[PDB]
């Protein structure tokens, strides 16, 4: 069962300079609770939101995205750290 469903719009993971990556972290089992944002390599100071929209991603906006959602049965668990990085000019999808 997926305790933390991290769905990124660009499933390719890697995008081009200035790309827009939408981070959606919800639960297909339990209702969407307080989802805290965690990103290795300096996390982004943003409020706990289920859908994080990061448009025009710069070279300093890279990092592995993880969603720390406070579960009722369990607790505030992390997820798979998706390495959102910038590659050569092109599209991945």
């Amino acid at each position: 069962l997926e305790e933390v469903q991290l769905v990124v719009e660009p499933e390719g993971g890697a995008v081009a300079p200035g790309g827009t990556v939408t981070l959606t972290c919800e639960v297909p089992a339990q209702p969407s609770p307080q989802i805290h944002w965690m990103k290795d390599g300096v996390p982004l100071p943003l409020p706990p939101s289920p859908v994080l929209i990061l448009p025009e991603i710069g070279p300093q906006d890279q990092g592995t995205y993880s969603c720390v959602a406070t579960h009722s049965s369990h607790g505030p668990q992390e997820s798979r750290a998706v390495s959102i990085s910038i590659i050569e000019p092109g599209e991945e999808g």
């Binding site: 307080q34 805290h36 579960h71 505030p76 992390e78």
Partner: protein, 97 residues
Amino acid sequence: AAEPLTELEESIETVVTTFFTFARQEGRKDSLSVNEFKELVTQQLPHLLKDVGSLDEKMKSLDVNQDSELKFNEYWRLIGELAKEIRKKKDLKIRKK
């Protein structure tokens, strides 16, 4: 409940009471979350830690199993450094004036 402990238990108890204070703040009154971690480092630990910016490296060094829950043993790794800095933060000449 936490009944009056011995001289060697009350010392560590103080750590437990303070810990539980933040543990019952968010969900899962047992471990501290990433929120509490950052809130502590950049507020309750600016005089303790020489770095209040970077926390992802120190945190992942605790719960290397990706738990995001600073519970027993996991959080101990930081507790040890904290209890170490209180003695060797930079007192190689003078820190605790």
